[PDB]
Structure 1
Amino acid sequence: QVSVQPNFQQDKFLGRWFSAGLASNSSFLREKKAALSMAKSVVAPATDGGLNLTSTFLRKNQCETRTMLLQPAGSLGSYSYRSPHWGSTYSVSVVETDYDQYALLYSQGSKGPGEDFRMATLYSRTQTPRAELKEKFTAFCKAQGFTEDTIVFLPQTDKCMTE
């Protein structure tokens, strides 16, 4: 029931994004706030189909790298993520994007221990999204049922943002 960007163009969605905001129904991403920080995500086509999302971020004094395979899920802009460790599947949709400034992503659990997990993500091409950019995110989050207290604009880190 989640919207995908109309006429989504995957080859315009590639490259470097910064996670500049998030909201979730996690009982303790509600308390990892605010040890949460901005991540650099690099989007690239996977040879087996779909996109690889390579995220780099600061955790407890070091840079950690995570790669997520997003498999096409039936519609342009609609993907699925299968957790290798946790036998959970998530639907991941690019709800709205202008390709060169921002992308609003929505992730929802489908199967497994993460079944009822919900998360909205603000991707930004820059580390410093404009107000009207953050308002689109806030608007999307609140429409989705996220309360103001669960909406977090992730602060920049200096570390782990390099190539």
Structure 2
Amino acid sequence: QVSVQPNFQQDKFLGRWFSAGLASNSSWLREKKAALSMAKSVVAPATDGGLNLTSTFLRKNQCETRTMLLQPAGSLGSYSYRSPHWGSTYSVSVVETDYDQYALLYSQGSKGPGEDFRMATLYSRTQTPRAELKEKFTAFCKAQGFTEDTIVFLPQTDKCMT
């Protein structure tokens, strides 16, 4: 169902990214806003196989850091994530990227109570992606069935980014 970036090259996907947009279900957004803020996300190879995604961001008056392990799931650019909290698994795909400016990711619940969860994410090498990039994101989000009220862009911030 979900496309992956053709000939995905993980060697070129590493290092610092910023979360610049998201889209998800109505309910999740109902009490997870206010207020979502921009995250700094660092991508590095995992010795257990796959990639570690380490995110830092402002939440409840403090900078918080979290690490997500993404393991290969069958095709280059297609990964799986197991939540350590209650154990749900999620498909996480790098749908489209140019490596040096943007990446569009798509996450879907696979098994567990998180099964029906669907979320798209815009990652950007800069904190302020061009209008054209924000349009690639809106386009993918709408094509996947997200309504405009569920598509949220996250503004530039300095807090927790250093």
- Taking structure 2 as the reference length, the TM-score comes to 0.97
- Which whole-Å deviations, capped at 9, do the CAs of 1:83-118 have from their partners, x for residues lacking one? 011110000000000000000000000011100000
- Which whole-Å deviations, capped at 9, do the CAs of 1:7-54 have from their partners, x for residues lacking one? 000010000000000000151324423400100000000001100000
Identity of counterpart residues, as a percentage? 99
Range with greater deviation from structure 2 (25-34 or 50-59): 25-34
- Which whole-Å deviations, capped at 9, do the CAs of 1:121-160 have from their partners, x for residues lacking one? 0000000000000000000000000000000001222111
Whether contact under 8 Å (2:26, 2:150) holds in the other structure is no
Structure 2: gaps (5+ residues): none
Distance in 1 between the 2:61 and 2:69 partners? Answer: 26
Distance in 1 between the 2:26 and 2:14 partners? Answer: 28
Whether contact under 8 Å (2:120, 2:141) holds in the other structure is yes
Distance in 2 between the 1:102 and 1:57 partners? Answer: 19
Whether contact under 8 Å (1:23, 1:152) holds in the other structure is yes
Distance of aligned partners of 1:141 and 1:22 in 2 relative to their CA distance in 1, 3 Å threshold: same
Distance of aligned partners of 1:30 and 1:150 in 2 relative to their CA distance in 1, 3 Å threshold: farther
Distance of aligned partners of 1:41 and 1:52 in 2 relative to their CA distance in 1, 3 Å threshold: same
- Taking structure 1 as the reference length, the TM-score comes to 0.97
Distance in 2 between the 1:158 and 1:24 partners? Answer: 25
Distance in 1 between the 2:140 and 2:25 partners? Answer: 15
RMSD after superposition: 0.9
Whether contact under 8 Å (2:128, 2:155) holds in the other structure is no
Whether contact under 8 Å (2:44, 2:51) holds in the other structure is yes
Structure 1: gaps (5+ residues): none
Distance of aligned partners of 1:30 and 1:7 in 2 relative to their CA distance in 1, 3 Å threshold: farther
